[PDB]
Amino acid sequence: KEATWVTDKPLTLKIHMHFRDKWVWDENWPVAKESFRLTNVKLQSVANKAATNSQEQFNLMMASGDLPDVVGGDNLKDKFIQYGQEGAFVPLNKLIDQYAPHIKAFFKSHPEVERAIKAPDGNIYFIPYVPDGVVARGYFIREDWLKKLNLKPPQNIDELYTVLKAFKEKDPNGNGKADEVPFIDRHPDEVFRLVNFWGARSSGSDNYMDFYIDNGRVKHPWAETAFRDGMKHVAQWYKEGLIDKEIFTRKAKAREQMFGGNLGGFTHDWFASTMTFNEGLAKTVPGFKLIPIAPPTNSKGQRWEEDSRQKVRPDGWAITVKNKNPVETIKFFDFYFSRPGRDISNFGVPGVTYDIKNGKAVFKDSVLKSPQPVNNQLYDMGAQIPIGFWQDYDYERQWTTPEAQAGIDMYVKGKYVMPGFEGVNMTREERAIYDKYWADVRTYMYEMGQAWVMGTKDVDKTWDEYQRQLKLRGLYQVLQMMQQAYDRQYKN
Ligand SMILES: [Ca+2]
């Protein structure tokens, strides 16, 4: 018997969980075993390990009619809410208020998370994966190059331009060639984020090309005239070779290639992984050193870091109408918002991956020193998976180098990070319009954006037509449904 036991008699629940198009709940997972030991509730996987399309597997199950007790996975928010409104998933509101003290208190102190997951009928149909942490990407620059060229780190957009041209013109790698590529980035979409430097937004959240809220108004950044003026500068920079010619194609290994080759000297990427190149390249590129910098003041006079971590993920789990043990299940869910539950779901298994020290879960050196990334070690154990749980940033702090952490603290202290838009949940009516036109509009914008950057089309010559096409393709109907849903969810 454990102090955390949910039931006096061992309870086995059937769960369908398929996530990341490759994994399913594995009851042989060390964490799954520990979870059962601590709650007296065991999860039995009815999902198909061999299936390679998680979203599809969800549908075949839903159609199947024969439902399990619990359904979990990533990117299921939308489906949880729709199949919840037509009665397949049990509303959790009352269940939480009476049997989940930890979940209850969490929502109480994190109202924004609660709003974000509320279906249009006001019900809560799933417990979400709550991530921890605020800073996402940041700006990094070659300090050794600034060193050679004898320049100080840029404080505003003017100096930034000066510095990047220096990088391309004054041969910092000194191989007597003009082979330097100032801005590189493994995520092509980051090139559009550059418009931030001219007071224009490129997205309302960490998701690329997302809507944002401006004075209670749902808007799309790519449709604003601000974006037009920003793109003009971006296209000029591309024309001058300040931006990687292959920005749209290099992708994934851009850092290894460009940094390893000693060609690039500036990027916008995640703190942890980007800073590791300082160590992994000490050998191959002597003196190589990237430093995080506060975002240079933009033309409007402010420091902008548009990217941030979402406060809630569209992942989690729900209770089906067929679950004959709703209160035991909810108490079980609640365990994952309690410290002991947060411990195993974030750190793994005591004695194996961590140990309690000073009342804190502390990873073993073997775990931190391994070339295998901590996240992957945990996934293989059933930890850091898309069930409904409260993530603990301290697990991440432990494998983030001191230099990266200092950079992150600087961003938090600087208050440059803009709050992201957590999205809205739409009714059938609304969703119908969105699903019919959004994708078309989005791809259209992306194609024009790409052409504008590459100079394939002049922005000023095509802006009026671009605006015309946006209205013609449904932008306005999409926004109206977004606005309607927004007013209902955030203004009621
Ligand atoms: Ca050179």
* Domain membership of residue 232 as a residue range: 133-310+400-492
* Contact present, 389 and 274 (Cβ < 8 Å): no
Neighbours of 109 (CB within 10 A): 7
- Cα 478 versus chain centre, distance: 23
- What six digits make up the tokens of 118? 């509320």
Strands of 120-204, DSSP E:
127-128, 137-142, 181-183
> Ligand 1 centre from 257 Cα, in Å?
15
> Which amino acid type is present at position 198?
W
Domain boundary among 365, 399, 433: 399
Domain boundary among 380, 399, 418: 399
> Ligand 1 centre from 167 Cα, in Å?
9
**Which residues have a Cβ under 8 Å from the Cβ of 36 and sit 6 or more positions away?**
10, 42, 43
Number of domains the chain is built from: 2
Find the helix or strand (DSSP H, E) in which 218 lies: strand 217-219
Match 């292959």 to its residue by tokens: 246
Same domain, 368 and 486: no
Same domain, 195 and 71: no
Annotation: binding site for Ca(2+): 133, 171, 173, 175, 177, 179-180, 436, 440
How many Å apart are CA 305 and CA 420, to the nearest integer?
Answer: 11
Same domain, 369 and 391: yes
Q: In the Cβ-directed half-sphere of 32, how many Cα atoms lie within 13 Å? A: 19
**Which residues have a Cβ under 8 Å from the Cβ of 217 and sit 6 or more positions away?**
483
CATH number of the domain where residue 74 is located: 3.40.190.10
Label residue 189 exposed, middle or buried (CB < 10 Å: 0-12, 13-18, 19+): middle
Same domain, 303 and 359: no
Residue (of 164, 29, 100) closest to 389 by Cα position: 100
- What six digits make up the tokens of 184? 């590189």
Same domain, 278 and 351: no
* Contact present, 311 and 112 (Cβ < 8 Å): yes
How many Å apart are CA 115 and CA 490, to the nearest integer?
Answer: 7
- What six digits make up the tokens of 428? 């059938």
Match 């992306």 to its residue by tokens: 446
Buried b (16+ CB within 10 A) or exposed e, 65-99: eebbbbbbbbebbebbbbbbbeebbbbbeebbeeb
How many Å apart are CA 448 and CA 223, to the nearest integer?
Answer: 11
> Ligand 1 centre from 169 Cα, in Å?
8
> 3-state DSSP: the chain helix, strand, coil percent, rounded to 5?
45, 15, 40
Return the DSSP state at 350: B
Annotation: binding site: 133, 171, 173, 175, 177, 179-180, 436, 440
Q: Is 388 helix (H, G, I), strand (E, B) or coil?
A: coil
> Ligand 1 centre from 313 Cα, in Å?
43
Same domain, 1 and 60: yes
> Ligand 1 centre from 251 Cα, in Å?
22
> Ligand 1 centre from 271 Cα, in Å?
27
How many Å apart are CA 273 and CA 309, to the nearest integer?
Answer: 16
**Which residues have a Cβ under 8 Å from the Cβ of 340 and sit 6 or more positions away?**
4, 38
Same domain, 392 and 443: no
- Which spans in 261-338 are helix H? 271-275, 277-280, 326-335
* Contact present, 269 and 255 (Cβ < 8 Å): yes
Neighbours of ion ligand 1 (CB under 5 A): 171, 173, 175, 177, 179
How many Å apart are CA 66 and CA 64, to the nearest integer?
Answer: 5
> Ligand 1 centre from 295 Cα, in Å?
26
> Ligand 1 centre from 96 Cα, in Å?
62
Taking phi over 0 as left and psi of -120 to 50 as alpha, with beta for the rest, 397 belongs to alpha
Same domain, 159 and 273: yes
Same domain, 298 and 182: yes
Name the CA radius of gyration of the chain, rounded. Answer: 24
- Which residues are bridge partners to 350 per DSSP? 354
Match 């300082």 to its residue by tokens: 278
Find the helix or strand (DSSP H, E) in which 395 lies: helix 393-397
**Which residues have a Cβ under 8 Å from the Cβ of 403 and sit 6 or more positions away?**
275, 278
Match 């597997």 to its residue by tokens: 57
Q: β-strands 41-45, 11-19: how paired?
A: parallel
- What six digits make up the tokens of 79? 């489906």
How many Å apart are CA 254 and CA 181, to the nearest integer?
Answer: 11
Same domain, 34 and 119: yes
How many Å apart are CA 387 and CA 402, to the nearest integer?
Answer: 30
> Which amino acid type is present at position 66?
D
Same domain, 121 and 218: no
How many Å apart are CA 245 and CA 238, to the nearest integer?
Answer: 7
- What six digits make up the tokens of 228? 């037009």
How many Å apart are CA 186 and CA 260, to the nearest integer?
Answer: 13
How many Å apart are CA 282 and CA 263, to the nearest integer?
Answer: 15
Same domain, 120 and 269: no
> Ligand 1 centre from 390 Cα, in Å?
48
Long-range contacts of 348-356 (CB under 8 A, 24+ apart): 348/30, 348/31, 348/377, 348/378, 348/381, 348/383, 349/30, 349/31, 349/33, 349/34, 349/381, 350/34, 352/30, 352/381, 353/377, 353/378, 353/381, 353/383
Domain boundary among 367, 399, 431: 399
- What six digits make up the tokens of 338? 């309690």
* Contact present, 77 and 69 (Cβ < 8 Å): no
How many Å apart are CA 163 and CA 380, to the nearest integer?
Answer: 44
> Ligand 1 centre from 159 Cα, in Å?
21
> Ligand 1 centre from 297 Cα, in Å?
28
The two most distant CA atoms of the chain are separated, in Å, by 76
- What six digits make up the tokens of 339? 């410290």
**Helix 339-347 × helix 326-335 angle, to 10°:** 70
> Ligand 1 centre from 171 Cα, in Å?
4
> Ligand 1 centre from 180 Cα, in Å?
5
